């Protein structure tokens, strides 16, 4: 009605978009604090695992390696040759923090 004055309407809308943004930002730090408090903590110490059967069924008929390595460990894959070269694939693991555990699941 009042001519134009999409300003007061756009300005009011931008205000709520800030309310939506800091509501999401606040919900994230909620889930994050919620996540770490169920993980890091001790009555869930030995309950964070999958079984042999769990993994085998996600990749039915695949040979499976489970790598357990310190975070930041380098996992390097050479970019392969094209056709007219032998297509070989490779994984290089190198850690600095601690040793790496590799489990053959198959």
């Amino acid at each position: 009605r009042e001519i134009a004055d999409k300003l007061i309407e756009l300005k009011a809308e931008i205000e709520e978009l800030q309310q939506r943004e800091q509501e999401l930002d606040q919900h994230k730090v909620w889930v994050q604090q919620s996540i770490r408090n169920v993980t890091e903590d001790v009555q869930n110490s030995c309950l964070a695992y999958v079984t042999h059967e769990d993994i085998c069924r996600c990749f039915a008929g695949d040979t499976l390696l489970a790598i357990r390595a310190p975070s930041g460990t380098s996992l390097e894959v050479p970019i392969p040759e094209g056709l007219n070269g032998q297509k070989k694939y490779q994984i290089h693991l190198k850690s600095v923090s601690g040793p790496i555990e590799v489990l053959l699941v198959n």
Binding site: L10, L24, H27, I55, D62, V102, L103
Partner: protein
């Protein structure tokens, strides 16, 4: 023509706010899936163990955190390992893929299929029960 340009400069800012809202909503929903899948896994294993009256053998179980390398059963793998186990080198004669533990958990169904907009009634019952009361709106949304 002042008014006209200030309308443009507020629709610019609004578009910028809107897409940062889209990104944080996606990031939040990813965090919510991780919370659901993790708590769901800890509960399934908890009840499994307090039925067997015992925690599974040392093998037969892969503890988090981990990553998985999968390749065809007919792929030939050879491996070199350093003594300290700080360096491994694997050769494959065919392609492989690598997956983080969280996406293995999603494939197990521990995120109650929410990762795909597909959810049973018995799945959204538990999914919603695993999150704080205020973020149940998100969970209901991700089940379409």
């Amino acid at each position: 023509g002042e008014f006209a340009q200030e309308c443009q400069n507020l629709e610019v800012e609004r578009q910028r706010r809107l897409e940062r809202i889209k990104q944080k909503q996606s990031q939040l929903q990813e965090l919510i899936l991780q919370q659901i899948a993790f708590k769901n896994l800890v509960q399934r294993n908890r009840h499994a163990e307090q039925q067997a009256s015992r925690p599974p053998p040392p093998n037969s179980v892969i503890h988090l955190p981990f990553i998985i390398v999968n390749t065809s059963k007919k792929t030939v793998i050879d491996c070199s390992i350093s003594n300290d186990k700080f360096e491994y080198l694997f050769n494959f004669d065919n392609t492989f893929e690598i997956h983080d533990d969280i996406e293995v958990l999603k494939r197990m169904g521990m995120a109650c299929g929410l990762e795909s907009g597909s959810c049973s009634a018995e799945d959204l019952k538990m999914a919603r029960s695993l999150v704080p009361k205020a973020l149940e709106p998100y969970v209901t949304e991700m089940a379409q």
